[PDB]
Write a protein that binds this ligand. Structure first.
Ligand SMILES: CCCCNC(=O)c1cc(S(N)(=O)=O)c(Cl)cc1NC1CCCCC1
Ligand SMILES: CCCCNC(=O)c1cc(S(N)(=O)=O)c(Cl)cc1NC1CCCCC1
Ligand SMILES: [Zn+2]
Ligand SMILES: [Zn+2]
Lengths: 260, 260
């Protein structure tokens, strides 16, 4: 059992999950001193991101986040290996402190963060097998700030009242996942890191887009208030809030940028 | 054994020091969302901070920081109990990333941080005993930024070459500790927290002064390059760099300011 609060919280994860105290942990603060321009960081191609609108995809409350299952025909091109999609999920704060992004930029939290998880389908036969192996995973990270209402994010958020409790599921019709990505996806940070949740394996190639997307105050407040980490039958509910890991030491590592 | 890097680093402190996984952990990000002005917060008075020039005070490299021993007749007035000085020490980064403060303000790391550690002498016979009782310790935190040469900090920094290795000691002649303090000390952040190092006991009343001090380019670089966490007889020396804890979660709690 692990939480983001109290005795079972992030300072104690290493007691249950060895890699959480290991090398190459994520997330990190993106700041000037550790950035290095790299011209060989070329645009990624998002292939099969336009999901079949005639297909439905499973949304689950797994007690730590809300997760959308993705099909393996969706993938990233441009990296050395092909990486096929497995799921996306989010990280957020709470109404009294709506700064719940995992990555920070010059010490500043965004409201929230989206992760699109991909596994190395050239080297490994599935995402579970890949997760603890060399070059196993690649995540796209989208930083989210309070702003304009986002119709694309609402294709997920519109279903939150039907996954309020741990283990609840809802079907989401196919839409274009590329719509969840910000402007100028050519501009990104790249570094070698880890899962930000147990088991914290140091197997992730990270791509954090430079530009945030916006969702509205009300979309943000829905995300922060809809979900519980407890089961529906539990008469002592706990709210699912502040499900973000604190930033990690970045000792020796640099962050490579496609922009300058 | 505990360090700030690799497998005995801060994510693993809780394995041997369970309070590092516990309540009221320090340091923290000082940001608007969790600040409350509190008009009842009056200026601290610094008593016997002018140390006798005829007396010598022990500087030690304890393998984690450089520590200056202070006398119990050095004290703070204006808390609920008398807090008597026991030691001061420093936290810092590295020449490639010169941002090594423990506390951050609106996500901004300072160059370095000084802590003047006091203990509740009205209730406890000594600092060691006070250190595991609530309101047992009070710490004064000074944020440090690069700027003009600081002759007062050089009263400490001129001795670093005699305490390069763990266990090494030197004597520093008494000087006015108050000279290490910033302008308008009446402006501070105040909150209940912990030791920022093992054993992480939740027993500190924190005062972080609002205004930083400056040390020069060359002073900060001397601090960052002078010392090793290893003993002189260790064949695998380790440079004492990045000896600061990451900021902690601060959920359902407030920092009080003495300023509006
Ligand atoms: C949904 C949030 C709760 C638990 N965390 C995850 O599911 C999770 C989070 C991340 S992240 N937060 O992007 O670093 C990564 Cl890379 C991978 C994860 N799972 C693996 C996905 C592939 C199969 C093995 C499980
Ligand atoms: C930095 C030096 C490495 C080892 N840690 C300490 O000496 C230390 C650091 C802090 S801190 N960084 O100010 O929170 C505090 Cl409050 C107390 C500490 N120790 C004593 C333990 C018992 C006697 C009284 C004090
Ligand atoms: Zn994630
Ligand atoms: Zn300290």
């Amino acid at each position: 059992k692990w939480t983001y609060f109290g005795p079972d919280g992030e300072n104690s994860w290493s007691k249950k999950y060895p890699s959480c105290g290991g090398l190459l942990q994520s997330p990190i603060d993106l700041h000037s001193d550790i950035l290095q321009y790299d011209a060989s960081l070329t645009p990624l191609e998002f292939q099969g991101y336009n999901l079949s609108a005639n297909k439905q995809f499973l949304l689950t409350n797994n007690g730590h986040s809300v997760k959308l299952n993705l099909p393996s025909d969706m993938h990233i091109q441009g990296l050395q290996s092909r990486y096929s999609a497995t799921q996306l999920h989010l990280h957020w704060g709470n109404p009294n402190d709506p700064h719940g992004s995992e990555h920070t930029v010059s010490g500043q939290h965004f409201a929230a963060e989206l992760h699109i998880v991909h596994y190395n389908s050239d080297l490994y036969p599935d995402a579970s097998t890949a997760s603890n192996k060399s070059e196993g995973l690649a995540v796209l990270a989208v930083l989210i700030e309070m702003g304009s209402f986002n119709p694309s994010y609402d294709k997920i958020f519109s279903h939150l009242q039907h996954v309020k409790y741990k283990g609840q599921e809802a079907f989401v019709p196919g839409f274009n996942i590329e719509e969840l990505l910000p402007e100028r996806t050519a501009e990104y940070y790249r570094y070698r890191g880890s899962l930000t949740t147990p088991p914290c394996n140091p197997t992730v190639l990270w791509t954090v887009f430079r530009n945030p997307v916006q969702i509205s105050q009300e979309q943000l407040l829905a995300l922060e208030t809809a979900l519980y980490c407890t089961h529906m039958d539990d008469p002592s509910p706990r709210e699912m809030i502040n499900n973000f890991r604190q930033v990690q030491k970045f000792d020796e590592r640099l962050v490579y940028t496609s922009f300058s």
